[PDB]
């Protein structure tokens, strides 16, 4: 009584590429599964995709002489009989190192019911509304990203320019040290015999040095202010994108889901892209 048609089974997903199975089995608990036609397209193979150990194990179903099974002794009369048997029997019987059961089938209806308003007239308007939002979101997202990446460059250039200011300040400071040690007392002070060279020459030089070091020190501080303000703005742009991105993901799924189940399956049209 429990052996129904495979076509009407809620986990047999029909013809889907290996790629399409992957997004549906993404980050799912061990035991998630679904069935589909073999990639070869020779009907009568029905590869089984079983999620175990974070991996998508990919098992094959054989159909020799109108029977089914995993190994050579095919002892099942149909896939639904085979799938149902292992929905309560652990696969360890088939393989000791595959201790799982088919627990969480990826029902085709369970997710398909998410879409509503099957009427094509409503879908045409509903789909167009989501596309305009999605396109606006992507346009807005790109605007921030370029600014975010561009602002990253200005930060890096600013940060390095600070280091160049560190070296220039350090270089000047060492010179002030040598000047005072050498020419402050050893030569001129010993020559303190009424000569005005110290008053004019040495003092005029030293003051000019001091005004130079301070001016460089001042420019570094003014630069640090821009970096601090830029760094904070750099973080803010990160927050805007970190919130925009998750929202933009959901629209993509919803717009696609309508197209898969309303605009293509319900009514096959070349007008599909005309709604947009």
């Amino acid at each position: 009584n429990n052996n129904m048609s495979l076509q009407d089974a809620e986990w047999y997903w029909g013809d889907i590429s290996r790629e399409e199975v992957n997004e549906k089995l993404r980050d799912t608990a061990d035991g998630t599964f679904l069935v589909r036609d073999a990639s070869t397209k020779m009907h009568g193979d029905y590869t089984l995709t079983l999620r175990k150990g974070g991996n998508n194990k990919l098992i094959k179903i054989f159909h020799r002489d109108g029977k089914y099974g995993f190994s050579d002794p095919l002892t099942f009369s149909s896939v639904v009989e085979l799938i149902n048997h292992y929905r309560n029997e652990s696969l360890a019987q088939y393989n000791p190192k595959l201790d799982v059961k088919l627990l969480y089938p990826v029902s085709k209806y369970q997710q398909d019911q998410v879409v509503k308003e099957d009427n094509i007239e409503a879908v045409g308007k509903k789909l167009h509304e989501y596309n305009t939002q999605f396109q606006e979101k992507s346009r807005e997202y790109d605007r921030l990203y370029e600014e975010y990446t561009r602002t990253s460059q200005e930060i890096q250039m600013k940060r390095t320019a600070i280091e160049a200011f560190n070296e220039t300040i350090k270089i000047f400071e060492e010179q002030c040290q040598t000047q005072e040690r050498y020419s402050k007392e050893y030569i001129e002070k010993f020559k303190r015999e009424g000569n005005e060279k110290e008053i004019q020459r040495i003092m005029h030089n030293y003051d000019k040095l001091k005004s130079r070091i301070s001016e460089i020190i001042d420019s570094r501080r003014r630069l640090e202010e821009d970096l601090k303000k830029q760094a904070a703005e750099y973080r803010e742009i990160d927050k805007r994108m970190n919130s925009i991105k998750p929202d933009l993901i959901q629209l993509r799924k919803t717009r696609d889901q309508y197209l898969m189940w309303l605009t293509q399956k319900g009514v096959r049209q070349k007008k599909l892209n005309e709604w947009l």
Partner: peptide, 11 residues
């Protein structure tokens, strides 16, 4: 340009 001579001068 400004040159920092080794005698603690600036030119």
């Amino acid at each position: 340009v400004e040159c920092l001579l080794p005698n603690g001068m600036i030119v």
